[model samples]
Target: KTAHSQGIEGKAMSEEWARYYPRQFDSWKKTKESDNITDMLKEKPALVVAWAGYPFSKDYNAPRGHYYALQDNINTLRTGAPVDGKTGPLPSACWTCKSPDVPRIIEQDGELEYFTGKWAKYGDEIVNTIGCYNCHDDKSAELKSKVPYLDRGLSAAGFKTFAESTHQEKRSLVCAQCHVEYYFKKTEWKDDKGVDKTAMVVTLPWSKGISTEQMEAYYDEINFADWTHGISKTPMLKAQHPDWELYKTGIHGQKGVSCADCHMPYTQEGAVKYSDHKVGNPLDNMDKSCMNCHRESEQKLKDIVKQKFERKEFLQDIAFDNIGKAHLETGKAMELGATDAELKEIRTHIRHAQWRADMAIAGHGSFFHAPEEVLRLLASGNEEAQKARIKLVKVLAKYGAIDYVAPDFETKEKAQKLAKVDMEAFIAEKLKFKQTLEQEWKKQAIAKGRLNPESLKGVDEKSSYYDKTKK
Candidate 1:
């Protein structure tokens, strides 16, 4: 057996504690080794236009798994290569939830320094996949909210500390660390010496509330826009995954069903009954995940899930098409010399319309989590989008461009071209950066004894380890 360190900080790698919990650790490893990706942009190219001028439009793949959090961030076109460790659009706060090393780094350097720090500067420091230390206290062996932003969010929501909250609340709260909607917030403060300092921190928009309209209102109050729409020129609010928020508005959450209840059901390993760590879709493991509480057979449960998704998708299709056309029509109106003053209300319509649409689109699981709320949001979004298009038509007529034809989009490539996303350049730069910059980062981490020398063995993207059959 291998030696284990007892005084290990919360930053310990997931594999280090394997001997104590083989089943849980091994299952956790399965998350990284598998590939469950959906080409979101390819499926709905409207996202390309919706997230125009944002890195998300450059490339956004559905999260493969927590294990690939670090790998995926580095490889994705959204997070550009930092080139020489000091340069990158993404701040170090970006890694707060991606790796367990984050806690260790926050401890070594002050939170202010780390959050505002450079992403590549900590590239090697955050090599470990998210696990063990993220949600569990190594010494106490109990669940805790290890994420600071989450603690801030909970407090802002008028909730008590983690120790005061019920066990059920902690269950879902652990997942809420990253599953909830958040944005990069620029903060200013004075140092111990009273020197003015600034940090772009990961912040939750929960001061107003967690509902769709409430969070939207919070962003609006701050006059914050994730990015200006490249085509529509509307200041936009891009929704991050609001899984926890949406789930709370649903039946299961209202009835006190924690995320663990459905997603990470308990498993009886012969005599030992423990929460299964192989977290995935509840439908995938109906016997333990769903059938435990619900009296429905596996197939019937799936049929129910399928119907709900289909219903959501039915509304989703019309919503996205109209929103997509609304954006294009706004772009056309602008090209016809429509002044910003004339396009003010049109842009507001586009903003709110797309905000409603994106609120649904970002939370991929919200369809099943809160089907009714999802339907309402989509219907309202569809209605607003149509309004924007009608106003665009009127504006075009005023400009005497009645015959102006909106550009057609038949594929992802067409939409991306219109959005001015240079995929080829981004892809090429990322490949080169990964090949050179990544190796240098590993060597430095190894020199400082911060990284496991053998950690780089099997995680290459092209390695034969990825799962095709599982999906």
Candidate 2:
């Protein structure tokens, strides 16, 4: 009965040890630091552009770890302080993915009460990482906690085993915390008390489908656009990572693989085995990460990854040409007084084209994770995009402004600007905001005088730690 005994013993040991191993417990407690937030803000400005007219465009960053969720939200430019009359840059819906405090706040005060307040207004209450309560029930610690909207999505997809959706799927589902497409629901829904209230419900846009194109279509049918494109002036759709959704279209997902399958695998130390929580690049730990079941040499597996990446890159180049064509065509059509109907069709094409391409390329590991499927999707995206451009050219000719050739916008900045974004002013404002936020975060840290340098220690670089050795 080693198996049964081991399970029981492990549970007992973890519970008992957690009490005495406060250092280990605390170390596992993750939180976003000021530097982490600053670096993140600088690293992904495109996100800012995508979220223009939203608080996210003002300030958004990748979560450093699960622990950093609450702190990151509290300190981000997106969730500006309300005490200084900053009405809060974001909606209460923003808190959905940030912490376990969400359910608590919602439960005690009701959904409307929780979502109606400014983000900064809850700072005193929401000062913890995405905690055990997020994934576990308080009394039993059973893996039963789930967001109702997500469950609705699963139900709509005709799935009844959402709670049992394999260990691998859970990996990405964890990421699904913040990386999925969502919309705010503004309706008066009845509560458990049989009373009516205007509640802000966060719903995932998965009713139509998860394919980027389909999702866009769903949005279009609803006339949903994140904001008017600053350049093209067309209603623009902002594609989120769509990673899990796209991942579903890939071979790995079809094969029932998940992000944790490669990024964080199980490890054995003597007789003890546990899931490695240091999620990161699979290239860093081939032996325990991929090679365990891959049965290939480290170099061979690495080649597979590289080749998949190259294929993705090749497709991206083709996609870029197609995107450029669409944008130029749309701009030319608008210039020639193309009717709103015709322009709308062209914009719809652009929306779908970019959505497909973006979804295909959102996850870095997708190529290798699903080589054949990724290629197929990329090829299909290219065909659709090119076909859309051909249609655009025909429309342009009818509008009497057929472009000789589309202008080549080499960089994102140029492309965005050509597509109608005020890059310089937007970038300047974003940078200034980031600098101010960082300075304030630092000021608060200094005044508190509880800053611990060790708290900002390096992440487990072991994922790609082998790559350095190979070099």
Candidate 3:
């Protein structure tokens, strides 16, 4: 009898494993309707002023699971639309984190060349979302790093070689490959051999360290900024999700807990034992996962998590209010003819404030993973934001502006209008682009023999290549 007949949980041979994982699919589906901070932004329109000149101002939403990665990228307005051989707002680098196809293309073409050009330049080639091959070796099924950029980033940050890392560290490293903070370094920097590195490379500013202050220092030394803020005119640093980084600072991590320990806990099915591949919130499987370590009842553990969540929310609310007000006040100061010299200090405060705030909120699990660090960062952000507003008051007074009037940014539509984004036109173009490119991608995949419908046939029937569950 095969493993399936004996009720073993060995990996399925066919691609049907993607759909067969019910828990994974169900958990991800729930996120589609969940009200997140993006929904909160609609009510508090000041976020629009904060992200005014960025594409995020047009549309931003909470990220979903890996299943939605490709579709979400295609649908988000941040990517814009490439029509009639025109390039979109984003570059090909944006696709690096979205698919397993990215590493495939980088290997076939070249990493440096792959990093260059517009997003649509790679539309047809990158058709597959992340899959098993992304984290495991194809032949041996051993966990390994597939993305070269991640290797380069780790090396740049002075991390120990992956081969030298412990099993637990390797487990966390796989997640850190994409879940950590990064920036696309656009300017040319010299290598050790004095060779100019000119590619718009995604880099981790972890050479100094991974903390908020250290990253800020690293960026300051390089004079690097993601973009100039629309209101404050500050050279802004956009913090991407740093879940893995913040987790390392937490109690569980300090005690040597790997991400997989909590996220992909081991499960026993009859005589078979295997790590559950349905990675998600640990709260969903408290009895199976957390209870292995914590003696507390599930309700007590939940209460602990909820307490951290509430504290994070409270800190975030205060930080956002102050930062948003800083933006509005800075904009008013500028309107009153504040000079660049006069506004320099205010801009610096805004940059630091926003960075700290983002460091706390951007991490998906920071509130629970490292509650102390999250609270500390948000508190610093609130202080910096207040400082920016205080400086803006002085600037406005010097420019003879008596009072600053705040604009109504009550809804998404209102904010979009203020930003002058043609939402209707953008949506129409995006739909057209997806319709045209998505079909071409499928056609190309089939023509190249990368996708074969015949490969999926008869996988459920009892045969040498098939397994049937026994009663």
Candidate 4:
């Protein structure tokens, strides 16, 4: 047992503790030992910027060896446990992204039962099952297999066509099984005693569209906000991984390449070639990766990947600037006491601007996957952001506040302040509470004995993770 900055530190020191805590150690060891890449597929740098308002923005890092799962969770800035104030750094929703035990808990308790409280409440029960069962069906135990009845129904409806769906699509789909954007929809009710009971329901925004604009519009239409802006009084939207959506607009998707083409490309062992389940950028293994089919030399291919990365960075810079402008303009509108009617349009602007920024920032692979489409999305985002500011300026002018200069704040800290985020106190409070809850788990573990928090540690072309499995 070992620990690092990810927090809890202890060893299964006493044999008595180990004897009593076999289940806990076994679960922790399972995550630490497994080499399966299903969970690793999520190790992308772009997530840091994409999940800005969320915990992901803080300490997102590439996936390391399996042994680090528990430690990884503890170390992440996203896990707001054990701080000074607040219920803890994260909600139980964080656990959903990290474990296999989740589905089972949901089943035993019911879907509503699964999401009923803060993450700390069930952190102990959520142990090792995070890896395998998180994505695969336990009953069938099939790798990458879906519920047959659900598949059959969806297929029968023509909602999913066999012809249009390629093997590469399936590869990516497996990753999408968990790596996509989602949120918890909480429903509250009074029990027989008139006490409020809440159930957290997980939901995806994909029914509308995967593009930034479409999802934001869905949220805006619903007037949804994870938490209101501390400064602007405008609702802010948080973007999650848009890998699938962004990939859809890339050349890989158009050329029929899939996620498996890159992240989980084929590998040869002995005389047989099979998909290397170690999901990640193909650039990590050029000889067996893009170099196999892409005619360019390794250097040229590397150059191409870098070029695409640069293009994305360029677009992202502009998008972030625009987003900042929108926030500033929103503040200006509020200062003028713009009526709720005018504020309505202002909210719409903030939504679109942030959504566009999110789309641009979220998809690190899009530049290489679909340069044309990525550019188009970026262009449209700029247009939308500009449009939002334009409207905001008009409203401000009507109230004689047109002279307002948008805040030139740079850096997330300043922006968060400008947006009225209580950065220090929020982090401190979230961390403190997380620690308090985790303290009990540690005590229970120590009374039993265990160690936690370990360590931390792309590429591309036109192929999607899905396209490869079929051939």
What tens digits encode model 3's per-residue C-alpha lDDT throughout 170-204?
Answer: 98888887888998867455545676655566777
**Residue 437 accuracy (lDDT) in model 4:** 62
lDDT of 1 by residue, 411-469 (tens): 78998998898887887777788789988888887888777765555455531113324
Indicate which candidate wins on lDDT.
1
lDDT of each: 0.79, 0.57, 0.71, 0.54
For model 1, state the Cα shift of residue 468 in Å: 13
The reply for model 2, stretches above 4 Å from the true place, is 1-89, 117-125, 130-132, 164-175, 189-200, 208-217, 398-400, 404-407, 412-416, 419-471
lDDT rank order: 1, 3, 2, 4
Q: Whole-model lDDT, candidate 4?
A: 0.54
**Per-residue error at 210 for model 3, in Å?**
1.0
Model 3: how far residue 216 lies from native, Å: 1.1
Which of 1 and 4 is the better model by TM-score? 1
Model 1: how far residue 361 lies from native, Å? 1.8
Which pairs clash (backbone N, Cα, C closer than 3 Å) in model 1?
none
Tell how far residue 381 is off in model 1, in angstroms. Answer: 1.3
Each prediction's total of clashing residue pairs, residues at least 3 apart in sequence or on different chains, is 0, 8, 0, 45
Per TM-score, the best of the predicted structures is: 1
Better of 2 and 3 by lDDT: 3
